[PDB]
Amino acid sequence: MVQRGSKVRILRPESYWFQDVGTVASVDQSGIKYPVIVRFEKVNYSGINTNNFAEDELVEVEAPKAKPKK
């Protein structure tokens, strides 16, 4: 589940930030090309920092917990 704060991988071959984990800034539910907003640290050929992606084009890859079960 992609909430505000969860980091996800980018699966958009068009996005300069392919194969990189960004952070979800906010989720808009009204009708846009990318309901979920993602943030990055690097830039691209256009010189951007934040963009918008769809949840289906993102994978959840947060730092796993170091404690399966005691």
Short mmCIF file of N, CA, C and O in Angstrom, two decimals:
data_model
loop_
_atom_site.label_atom_id
_atom_site.label_comp_id
_atom_site.label_asym_id
_atom_site.label_seq_id
_atom_site.Cartn_x
_atom_site.Cartn_y
_atom_site.Cartn_z
N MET A 1 0.85 -1.22 0.00
CA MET A 1 0.00 0.00 0.00
C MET A 1 0.88 1.26 0.00
O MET A 1 1.73 1.43 0.85
N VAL A 2 0.73 2.09 -1.00
CA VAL A 2 1.62 3.28 -1.12
C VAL A 2 1.00 4.48 -0.39
O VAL A 2 0.14 5.16 -0.91
N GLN A 3 1.46 4.75 0.81
CA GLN A 3 0.93 5.93 1.56
C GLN A 3 1.94 7.08 1.51
O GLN A 3 2.99 6.98 0.90
N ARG A 4 1.66 8.16 2.19
CA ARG A 4 2.62 9.30 2.24
C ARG A 4 3.80 8.96 3.16
O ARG A 4 3.66 8.90 4.37
N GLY A 5 4.95 8.72 2.59
CA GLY A 5 6.14 8.37 3.42
C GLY A 5 6.74 7.05 2.93
O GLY A 5 7.93 6.83 3.02
N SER A 6 5.92 6.18 2.39
CA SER A 6 6.44 4.88 1.86
C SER A 6 7.28 5.12 0.61
O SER A 6 6.86 5.78 -0.32
N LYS A 7 8.46 4.55 0.56
CA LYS A 7 9.32 4.69 -0.65
C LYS A 7 9.06 3.55 -1.64
O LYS A 7 8.90 2.41 -1.24
N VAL A 8 8.98 3.85 -2.91
CA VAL A 8 8.71 2.79 -3.92
C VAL A 8 9.72 2.88 -5.07
O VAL A 8 10.24 3.94 -5.37
N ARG A 9 9.94 1.79 -5.77
CA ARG A 9 10.85 1.82 -6.95
C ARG A 9 10.12 2.42 -8.16
O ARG A 9 8.91 2.39 -8.24
N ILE A 10 10.86 2.94 -9.11
CA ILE A 10 10.22 3.52 -10.33
C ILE A 10 10.27 2.51 -11.48
O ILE A 10 11.34 2.10 -11.91
N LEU A 11 9.13 2.14 -12.01
CA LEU A 11 9.11 1.20 -13.17
C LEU A 11 8.68 1.93 -14.44
O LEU A 11 7.97 1.40 -15.27
N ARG A 12 9.09 3.17 -14.59
CA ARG A 12 8.70 3.96 -15.79
C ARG A 12 9.92 4.18 -16.70
O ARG A 12 10.70 5.08 -16.46
N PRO A 13 10.04 3.36 -17.73
CA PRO A 13 11.19 3.49 -18.67
C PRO A 13 11.31 4.92 -19.20
O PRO A 13 12.39 5.37 -19.55
N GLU A 14 10.23 5.65 -19.22
CA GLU A 14 10.28 7.07 -19.69
C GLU A 14 10.87 7.96 -18.59
O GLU A 14 11.40 9.03 -18.87
N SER A 15 10.74 7.57 -17.35
CA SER A 15 11.24 8.43 -16.23
C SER A 15 12.77 8.35 -16.14
O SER A 15 13.34 7.28 -16.03
N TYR A 16 13.42 9.49 -16.09
CA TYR A 16 14.90 9.50 -15.88
C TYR A 16 15.28 8.78 -14.58
O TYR A 16 16.41 8.38 -14.39
N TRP A 17 14.35 8.67 -13.66
CA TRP A 17 14.67 8.04 -12.34
C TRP A 17 14.29 6.55 -12.35
O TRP A 17 13.90 6.00 -11.34
N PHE A 18 14.48 5.89 -13.47
CA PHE A 18 14.22 4.42 -13.52
C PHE A 18 15.14 3.68 -12.54
O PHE A 18 16.24 4.12 -12.27
N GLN A 19 14.70 2.56 -12.03
CA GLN A 19 15.55 1.76 -11.08
C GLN A 19 16.05 2.63 -9.92
O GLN A 19 17.18 2.51 -9.49
N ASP A 20 15.19 3.45 -9.37
CA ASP A 20 15.58 4.27 -8.19
C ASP A 20 14.41 4.37 -7.21
O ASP A 20 13.26 4.40 -7.60
N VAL A 21 14.69 4.39 -5.93
CA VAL A 21 13.60 4.46 -4.91
C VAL A 21 13.32 5.93 -4.55
O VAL A 21 14.19 6.64 -4.08
N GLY A 22 12.10 6.36 -4.71
CA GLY A 22 11.74 7.76 -4.33
C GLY A 22 10.80 7.73 -3.12
O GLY A 22 10.58 6.69 -2.52
N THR A 23 10.24 8.85 -2.76
CA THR A 23 9.30 8.90 -1.60
C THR A 23 7.94 9.46 -2.04
O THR A 23 7.88 10.38 -2.83
N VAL A 24 6.87 8.94 -1.50
CA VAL A 24 5.52 9.47 -1.85
C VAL A 24 5.25 10.77 -1.08
O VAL A 24 5.23 10.78 0.14
N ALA A 25 5.03 11.85 -1.78
CA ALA A 25 4.75 13.15 -1.09
C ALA A 25 3.25 13.26 -0.77
O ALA A 25 2.87 13.63 0.32
N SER A 26 2.41 12.94 -1.72
CA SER A 26 0.94 13.01 -1.48
C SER A 26 0.19 12.18 -2.53
O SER A 26 0.72 11.86 -3.57
N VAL A 27 -1.05 11.85 -2.26
CA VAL A 27 -1.86 11.07 -3.24
C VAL A 27 -3.11 11.86 -3.62
O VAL A 27 -3.94 12.17 -2.79
N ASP A 28 -3.26 12.18 -4.89
CA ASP A 28 -4.47 12.93 -5.34
C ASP A 28 -5.52 11.96 -5.90
O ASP A 28 -5.23 11.17 -6.78
N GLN A 29 -6.73 12.04 -5.41
CA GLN A 29 -7.81 11.14 -5.93
C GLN A 29 -8.89 11.97 -6.63
O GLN A 29 -9.92 12.27 -6.06
N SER A 30 -8.67 12.33 -7.87
CA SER A 30 -9.69 13.12 -8.62
C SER A 30 -9.70 12.70 -10.09
O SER A 30 -10.75 12.48 -10.67
N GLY A 31 -8.54 12.56 -10.69
CA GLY A 31 -8.47 12.13 -12.12
C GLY A 31 -7.25 12.75 -12.78
O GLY A 31 -7.34 13.75 -13.46
N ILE A 32 -6.10 12.14 -12.62
CA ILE A 32 -4.86 12.67 -13.26
C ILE A 32 -4.05 11.53 -13.87
O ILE A 32 -4.26 10.37 -13.57
N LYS A 33 -3.13 11.84 -14.75
CA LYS A 33 -2.31 10.78 -15.41
C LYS A 33 -1.53 9.98 -14.36
O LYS A 33 -1.23 8.81 -14.55
N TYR A 34 -1.24 10.58 -13.23
CA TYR A 34 -0.53 9.84 -12.14
C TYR A 34 -1.14 10.19 -10.78
O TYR A 34 -0.79 11.19 -10.19
N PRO A 35 -2.05 9.35 -10.31
CA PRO A 35 -2.71 9.59 -8.99
C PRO A 35 -1.67 9.81 -7.89
O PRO A 35 -1.88 10.60 -6.98
N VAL A 36 -0.62 9.04 -7.88
CA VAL A 36 0.37 9.10 -6.76
C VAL A 36 1.52 10.04 -7.12
O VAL A 36 2.02 10.01 -8.23
N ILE A 37 1.98 10.82 -6.18
CA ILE A 37 3.14 11.72 -6.45
C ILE A 37 4.42 11.11 -5.86
O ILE A 37 4.43 10.64 -4.73
N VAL A 38 5.49 11.13 -6.60
CA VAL A 38 6.78 10.57 -6.09
C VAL A 38 7.84 11.68 -6.04
O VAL A 38 7.82 12.61 -6.82
N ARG A 39 8.80 11.55 -5.15
CA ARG A 39 9.89 12.56 -5.07
C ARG A 39 11.25 11.90 -5.34
O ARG A 39 11.44 10.73 -5.06
N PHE A 40 12.18 12.65 -5.87
CA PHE A 40 13.54 12.08 -6.14
C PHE A 40 14.63 12.99 -5.58
O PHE A 40 14.36 14.10 -5.15
N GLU A 41 15.86 12.56 -5.61
CA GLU A 41 16.98 13.42 -5.14
C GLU A 41 17.84 13.87 -6.32
O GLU A 41 18.42 14.94 -6.30
N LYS A 42 17.91 13.07 -7.36
CA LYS A 42 18.71 13.45 -8.56
C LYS A 42 17.85 14.24 -9.54
O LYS A 42 16.64 14.29 -9.41
N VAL A 43 18.45 14.79 -10.56
CA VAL A 43 17.66 15.51 -11.61
C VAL A 43 17.73 14.74 -12.94
O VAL A 43 18.28 13.66 -13.01
N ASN A 44 17.21 15.32 -13.99
CA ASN A 44 17.28 14.66 -15.33
C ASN A 44 17.70 15.66 -16.41
O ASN A 44 18.20 16.73 -16.11
N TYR A 45 17.52 15.32 -17.66
CA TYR A 45 17.93 16.24 -18.76
C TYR A 45 17.09 17.52 -18.72
O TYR A 45 17.54 18.58 -19.13
N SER A 46 15.88 17.43 -18.22
CA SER A 46 15.01 18.64 -18.15
C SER A 46 15.36 19.47 -16.90
O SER A 46 15.20 20.67 -16.89
N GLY A 47 15.84 18.82 -15.87
CA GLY A 47 16.21 19.56 -14.63
C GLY A 47 15.00 19.61 -13.68
O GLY A 47 14.61 20.67 -13.22
N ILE A 48 14.43 18.48 -13.39
CA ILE A 48 13.26 18.44 -12.46
C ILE A 48 13.64 17.74 -11.15
O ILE A 48 14.64 17.05 -11.08
N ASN A 49 12.85 17.90 -10.13
CA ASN A 49 13.15 17.24 -8.82
C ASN A 49 11.98 16.35 -8.38
O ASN A 49 12.17 15.27 -7.86
N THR A 50 10.77 16.81 -8.59
CA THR A 50 9.58 16.00 -8.19
C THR A 50 8.71 15.70 -9.41
O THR A 50 8.70 16.44 -10.37
N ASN A 51 7.96 14.63 -9.36
CA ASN A 51 7.05 14.29 -10.50
C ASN A 51 5.84 13.51 -10.00
O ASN A 51 5.62 13.38 -8.80
N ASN A 52 5.05 12.97 -10.89
CA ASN A 52 3.86 12.17 -10.47
C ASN A 52 3.85 10.82 -11.18
O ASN A 52 4.02 10.74 -12.39
N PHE A 53 3.62 9.76 -10.45
CA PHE A 53 3.57 8.40 -11.08
C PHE A 53 2.31 7.66 -10.64
O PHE A 53 1.73 7.96 -9.61
N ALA A 54 1.90 6.67 -11.39
CA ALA A 54 0.70 5.87 -11.00
C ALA A 54 1.12 4.72 -10.07
O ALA A 54 2.25 4.25 -10.13
N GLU A 55 0.25 4.32 -9.18
CA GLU A 55 0.63 3.27 -8.18
C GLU A 55 1.02 1.97 -8.89
O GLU A 55 1.91 1.26 -8.46
N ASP A 56 0.34 1.64 -9.96
CA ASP A 56 0.65 0.38 -10.70
C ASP A 56 2.09 0.41 -11.24
O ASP A 56 2.70 -0.62 -11.44
N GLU A 57 2.62 1.59 -11.47
CA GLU A 57 4.01 1.69 -11.99
C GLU A 57 5.00 1.93 -10.84
O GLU A 57 6.06 2.49 -11.03
N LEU A 58 4.66 1.48 -9.66
CA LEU A 58 5.59 1.63 -8.50
C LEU A 58 5.61 0.35 -7.66
O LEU A 58 4.58 -0.24 -7.40
N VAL A 59 6.77 -0.04 -7.19
CA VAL A 59 6.85 -1.23 -6.29
C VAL A 59 7.25 -0.80 -4.88
O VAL A 59 8.09 0.06 -4.70
N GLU A 60 6.68 -1.41 -3.87
CA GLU A 60 7.04 -1.07 -2.47
C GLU A 60 8.38 -1.71 -2.09
O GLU A 60 8.51 -2.92 -2.08
N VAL A 61 9.37 -0.91 -1.80
CA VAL A 61 10.71 -1.47 -1.44
C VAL A 61 11.30 -0.71 -0.25
O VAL A 61 12.34 -0.08 -0.35
N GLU A 62 10.64 -0.77 0.88
CA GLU A 62 11.15 -0.06 2.09
C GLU A 62 12.20 -0.92 2.81
O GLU A 62 12.27 -2.12 2.62
N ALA A 63 12.99 -0.31 3.67
CA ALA A 63 14.01 -1.09 4.44
C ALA A 63 13.32 -2.16 5.30
O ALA A 63 12.63 -1.84 6.24
N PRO A 64 13.52 -3.43 4.95
CA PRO A 64 12.89 -4.53 5.73
C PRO A 64 13.21 -4.41 7.23
O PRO A 64 14.16 -3.76 7.61
N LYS A 65 12.44 -5.06 8.06
CA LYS A 65 12.72 -5.02 9.53
C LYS A 65 13.80 -6.04 9.89
O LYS A 65 13.82 -7.14 9.38
N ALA A 66 14.69 -5.68 10.78
CA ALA A 66 15.76 -6.63 11.21
C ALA A 66 15.28 -7.47 12.40
O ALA A 66 15.98 -7.61 13.39
N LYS A 67 14.12 -8.05 12.30
CA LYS A 67 13.61 -8.92 13.41
C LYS A 67 12.38 -9.72 12.94
O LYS A 67 11.26 -9.33 13.21
N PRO A 68 12.62 -10.81 12.24
CA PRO A 68 11.51 -11.66 11.74
C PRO A 68 10.55 -12.04 12.87
O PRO A 68 9.39 -11.66 12.88
N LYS A 69 11.03 -12.77 13.85
CA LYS A 69 10.17 -13.16 15.00
C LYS A 69 11.02 -13.73 16.13
O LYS A 69 11.75 -14.69 15.96
N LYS A 70 10.94 -13.14 17.30
CA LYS A 70 11.74 -13.65 18.46
C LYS A 70 11.01 -14.81 19.14
O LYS A 70 11.67 -15.62 19.75
#
